[PDB]
Nucleic acid binder design. Structure first.
Ligand SMILES: [K+]
Ligand SMILES: [K+]
Ligand SMILES: [K+]
Ligand SMILES: [Mg+2]
Ligand SMILES: [Mg+2]
Length: 136
RNA sequence: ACAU
DNA sequence: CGATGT
């Protein structure tokens, strides 16, 4: 089982969990940063991981790219497969933004098609995903 | 347990 | 040490 180097890798970064959430996507081969989301003041690790995959899907579809996406998040991979982010985060005025983005990401999944393979990055075998923030 |  | 998730 080898790395598919012709791929996009995504990851969340946070200050606290729940806390400030951001995410980015990189070229797995080169590490070039292809997109970065502006920090969202409150969210969870898994909401951010989910938004990162969906953004990757949208980014690759817009560019007519058939590359797969790597994520290290078992949870977010399943949420994308299900088209449903089963987060426990309370809904209130401070979490409104992240929940709006998550709701809109689900809605995009429910209105668009893609063949993009969404693959588990095998951290145990390969080290940290190339999109990692270096904060652990 | 496993994945973050 | 705490948290988010299956
Ligand atoms: K990190
Ligand atoms: K990890
Ligand atoms: K746990
Ligand atoms: Mg991650
Ligand atoms: Mg990481």
């Amino acid at each position: 089982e080898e790395i598919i180097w012709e791929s996009l890798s995504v990851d969340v970064g946070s200050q606290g969990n729940p806390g400030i959430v951001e995410y980015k996507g990189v070229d797995t081969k080169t590490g070039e940063v292809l997109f970065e989301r502006e920090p969202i003041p409150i969210g969870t690790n898994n909401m951010g991981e989910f938004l990162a995959i969906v953004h990757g899907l949208r980014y690759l579809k817009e560019r007519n790219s058939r590359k797969p996406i790597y994520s290290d998040s078992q949870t977010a991979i399943k949420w994308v497969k299900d088209k449903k982010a089963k987060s426990t985060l309370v809904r209130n005025e401070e979490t409104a933004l992240i929940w709006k983005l998550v709701d809109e990401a689900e809605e995009w999944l429910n209105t668009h098609t893609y063949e993009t393979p969404i693959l588990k990055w095998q951290t145990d075998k390969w080290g940290e995903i190339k999109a990692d923030y270096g904060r652990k």
